Chains A and B, each alone.
Chain A
């Protein structure tokens, strides 16, 4: 009588992943708390105001997808895993792209265009552009769920004394469908922030976004050979880990270094240092 096999919540790898979830989500909550602390401060305003808080919120809902992967599989869980991860991720990353856009409009685009376009990006239009990016993601997610859903596989002989249960993705294309929107946002952000350079005595915005994009790319690239090498039963663990580390890469390069100034060097929270 073969035993069914899937990740148990108590396994040390799942314990480690839910431990790392504590650091990721707690730091996200702490950064949101600090933003709430200095909400009206020009720093948060220069960082896009409330779009900043919303972004942090979205990031938490991204980490919230980590819970879907381990445990007894079901078809609903397999369907939900990818979209409910990447849709919040899009809701976050669109704002990073927007700030990257702001740095490009400021410091390469001629003034005659920039004076108008900077005011045109901000306001209701920033919120509606975030909504439009989420709409794209949702369309791609609908196409994925209908035409290319994953299948629950119970395999009876792939192991000596066990039957292996897990979600299996139809084609790498079906996953690529879900990774395109976020990948696109990252490409645009990097190209927008990479080559620009600031004057002295003003906040250095492009550097953090550049490091965030590089961390994102490196994480999701290293995630490939490991997912190819890892045992079939343990594929979820490297998925979860990516979602965690990817989120960490965004946190430690863009948000946390701003909270660092907010708490430990408040003299910089002055109007013309940002404006």
Chain B
């Protein structure tokens, strides 16, 4: 019987590699632009440490495609199933918690001073962003212990002559637990951002959060449905594609629009401008 896995001989595989290259180089452009604008008003609103780390995690994540392609080994199953999902969840949680932070902010001080008086100082929403993160770990790492690590194989029935090699035992059940919290976060951020799509806050970042979260939600729902309908060879390529596109959505859809103001509206770069967005 014949082994099957992604290889560069395949037009869509190299196409995903090229798309990931475009994404990584564009995100590198984003970061090197931010690198000489550390304390500008728009970068200052970005979140400070949060934006640098998020960008950095994403810059790493794009390497998945070269590591995902080719004859599998456990060395690749380690990252594609646990590490890169961690890199992605850190970013999704950051976006969603920022969306919550922006909206409903007015009610925090006046109605809940008992909370806000301490929640404002020194960490605030960071704490929740941390806890969600470890919660995902409880899903991920222990889950990998349950399935164990292996580049397993399965058969495609249209002709059982050929066999898929993949780092994902029980793919649908494996992905269900992973995607439950992804859907929860995506829908929560989508709701908060859409309700707040009018707000000018932080150079009107709610609209871009809305765009990115909508893309993530639609793509996740689509892939879960498609996997519930299909189990053949193509699952791995599409799954990779959906991943890379999602990365693009996070990079170009959220930081891209801010960078689109950085260099092109030096008027809005002015420090005195910011008070008009209160």
Contact = CB atoms under 8 A, between A and B. Distances in A.
A197 B197 contact: yes
Contacts of A221: 221-222, 225
A274 interface: no
B210 A195 contact: yes
A194 B211 CA distance: 9
B228 interface: yes
B225 A224 contact: yes
Contacts, number: 22
B229 A228 contact: yes
Contacts of A197: 197-198
Contact of A195 (B197, B222, B225, B229): B197
B249 to A, nearest CB: 15
Grouping DSSP codes into helix (H, G, I), strand (E, B) and loop, the B interface class, with mixed when no group exceeds half, is helix
B243 interface: no
B222 to A, nearest CB: 7
9 contacts: A194-B214, A195-B197, A195-B207, A195-B211, A221-B221, A221-B222, A221-B225, A222-B225, A224-B226
B175 to A, nearest CB: 14
Contacts of A225: 225, 228-229
Contacts of A194: 210, 214
A221 B207 CA distance: 26
A224 to B, nearest CB: 5
B228 A228 contact: yes
A197 B210 CA distance: 13
A182 to B, nearest CB: 17
Interface in B211-235: 211, 214, 218, 221-222, 225-226, 228-229
Interface residues of B, number: 13
A222 B221 CA distance: 10
B228 A224 contact: yes
Interface of B: 197-198, 207, 210-211, 214, 218, 221-222, 225-226, 228-229
Contacts of B228: 224-225, 228
Given A195-B211, A228-B228, 5 more contacts: A195-B210, A221-B221, A221-B222, A224-B228, A225-B225
A195 B111 CA distance: 30
Contacts of B214: 194
A217 B198 CA distance: 25
Given A195-B207, A197-B197, A224 B229 contact: yes
Contacts of B210: 194-195
B131 to A, nearest CB: 30
